[PDB]
Amino acid sequence: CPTHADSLNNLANIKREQGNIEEAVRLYRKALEVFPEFAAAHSNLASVLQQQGKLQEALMHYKEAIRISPTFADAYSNMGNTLKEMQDVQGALQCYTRAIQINPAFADAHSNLASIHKDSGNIPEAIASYRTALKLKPDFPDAYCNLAHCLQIVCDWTDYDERMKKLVSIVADQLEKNRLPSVHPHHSMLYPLSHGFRKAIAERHGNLCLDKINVLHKPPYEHPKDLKLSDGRLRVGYVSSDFGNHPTSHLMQSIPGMHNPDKFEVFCYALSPDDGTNFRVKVMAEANHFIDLSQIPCNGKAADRIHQDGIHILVNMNGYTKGARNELFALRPAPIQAMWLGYPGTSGALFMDYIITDQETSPAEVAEQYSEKLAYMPHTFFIGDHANMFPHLKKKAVIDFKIYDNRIVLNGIDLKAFLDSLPDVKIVKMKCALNMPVIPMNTIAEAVIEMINRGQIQITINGFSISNGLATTQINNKAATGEEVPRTIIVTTRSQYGLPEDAIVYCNFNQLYKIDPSTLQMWANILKRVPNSVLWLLRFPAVGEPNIQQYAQNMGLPQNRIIFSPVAPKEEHVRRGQLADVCLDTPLCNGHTTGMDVLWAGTPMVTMPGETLASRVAASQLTCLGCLELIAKNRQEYEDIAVKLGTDLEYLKKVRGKVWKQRISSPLFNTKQYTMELERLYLQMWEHYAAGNKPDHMIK
Template sequence: MPRSNDLSASDCCIDISNLSSIDAAKKINADRIHILIDVGDSTKDLEYEIFALKPAPIQVKLLGHPGTSGATFIDYLITDKQCSPPNLNYLYTEKLAYLNRTVFFGDHRLLFNDLSQRNSQNRTNFNETMCNFESFNTSSMYSVEKLYTRQMYNLPENSIVYCYFGQPYKINQTTLNMWITILKGVKNSVLWLLRFVEDTENNIREYFELNGINPVRIIFSNLAPKAEHLRRIQLADVYLDTPFYNGHKSCLDALWAGTPIVTLSGDSFVSRMTTSQLLAVNCTELIALVEFDYPRIAIQLGKHTNLLNRIRQQIWRSKITSALFDCESYCRELENLYLDMWKKLF
């Protein structure tokens, strides 16, 4: 069942959430659906039982769980050539249907358009940012002006702030070791993370301490509403991606906020998602191709203010016109791709 805010954009919506997998498949087949699209997570619910019954002539996987389904009953995976290079097509059970752009998109330009202009072009330490909510286009915003500062989040004013605002399950030991290398390479730096589970927080602090990093340099903050979250990302200097399993929405947020992201490009879909996003904003120099380069790039950004400022400005310029935040072009590309799939059937 689509989310309620999707219903108004639909010509027809049929609720099959209370049907069994067999009855749902029969309904889809009876309604003569040409292309059945999975936009969910194949590891949840019973939706793949429906797909396994092959109720539609063409069945497609789009986002949801990033990567191959491993299922023979999914005909196509919609992707791009950065996430799924043609030379790695043997890793997929589906045919690869390529968009002529990044497969990712964000609606930030529609919902958070006040962030399309920097409020202070000449900040040097990026310690504070002004938030004017009057131009926000959502009912949850208020017409007030608020100043966000590092002090609000217990961040040191004159330090380099590295951050990661994704789920902790994406952090593996290799990633932690690279983060330790970065903090050791930039003495006047801290790592800013989100607070999810107390045990996770304690384990991370303990691991850093065992490896020679004072745990006070690891700072945790609570989850926040989206508008505040986007603004506070601007207080950080560099966003550190998780190479094993890249950020998706969290990296979209960071790029819309204008914060550089350092990533390490791998072979799998999940380890190439941020590469796709960074290329969409013309930031190839933030993409490490080997493990050694990941901390090297992050340390360079932490030590060279001019480099950091230049890349920030590059992101701010590119994001305005980037396909990454262009929902209309994304829809047009998808429609053309679906038409091509249907034509190939005959």
């Protein structure tokens, strides 16, 4: 029997599908004023307050909802979601498990439990619960799409084509119904969705920020019109949660320090607390101003602080990644706001004006896949700090064993001083002033192999510190993470990783999720045409190794053909790429950071540009490098380019020597030049705004 609060609850549900979130709340509260013990009203209001970002208040109502109706398993699950968003993963987990125990048929709680496992790296546990969620409720888009990504992570390609079909049809059905797509924006790059579908996904998620900032009811910020208060300097704000030991900092850590202090005032806004790593230290020490916004939880106060600093250009280095606080940009504290480096896709949001890319990564004919206006960097938008982080890899030496450049390698700052102590050093000449010192198989060379084979940490030859490449973390942990430059000479051998000392080593150090059945087949074709070659992958994660292997067997590859290695420390991982001959890039989603890593080791990378931003980064890196012959227009050209490198040893030598020189000569790894080119682009943006114009494309 309907009461007076029961009709208000019905009316408030209508205001929820109307989008009128604010009026929905008022009607819920009026219902609770009539009926204090209305469990549904408490649950519903809390579900609305949760959207608004009023978590602590929503949580309060979820408690009441449960005290009234203890069998409200639906209220338990939603309280967990709230707690989960409040970083109380422990308490959130309890809510899901309690909900499941009250109602073992309640599918949503099973999904939410799987989500906790997924976020915590427990992929098989996530998969297991997602299947349970799906077995209870077969029409469960959230559970299906999340499971799909879990299967993607560990290379479970069971019914892959059928699955890709359902993923697309799910997003299609949801977009047509104006509902939030179950595919996350950062995952849309992995599925054969429409270019339009992906942008629409980014849009829906962008609008979730608008809901969380409309509750603040903040007036639009008044933005600067000149550089008067800034003393003629452009105030650029870099917003990231990755100031520390994170891939982002590994690329751009030098950049703030290289800005021109006569025209630019750098503001680094950290969304994460100090992790003590040297990456955080460098940025803090070199940026004109470092602001820790992790100690400013409220997006309102945070955005105020940004506006109070007088930022002209605010840079989003997160997009839709972990740790992002896009509500800051939704509040628009700056007149110009651009995406950069961090997120390999469009934000799809109104509050984002430009997207810093390049002609290669985002050609002008596919600008319709972005919501933002393109802002081309000259050569490539991608940058890496490898020049600064690993200067010990700038020059190498080898050891002979009767002459290759990837069997046994020595790197070190004092390497050339060490080679002068050795009697019979042969100097092999490269071509297109460069040289590669070779050590003959003598008592000193045998002493090094001894150290490697024995598994010793390090040895001492002529007073020099000769280190084992596998034990860098036991010698200098700072040097292993790339926080410092190794102060010893490091030995890197193929024997260390189980690599055959006479085979064409094809490597790919990307996370295994970037591989799809199409790519593995493409790689198998290459391996079959190059009989004495191996594919070198990483246990990233390790559970995906049996799957990748199994599919390789089914394509006709013996087990020995693919060699796996564990994930290494940052310094080791970059350095050990020297051991490979050719790097096979993943066409579905290019190796972005990992691509810069293999190129710094002087290893040629073969790529095939797709249509998505993520699938075109490697190509952009290679064009800037100066190696257009490592780019393929289709699958056939990909396999061909690779096979040629593994069969034509002279051609391989030329290309390897090409990468080895053009990693230094080209502007690919030049952080100073990059920063200046970035500065030039910044001014083009500001001048356009100061002219009174609205954001528009930038093609130099």
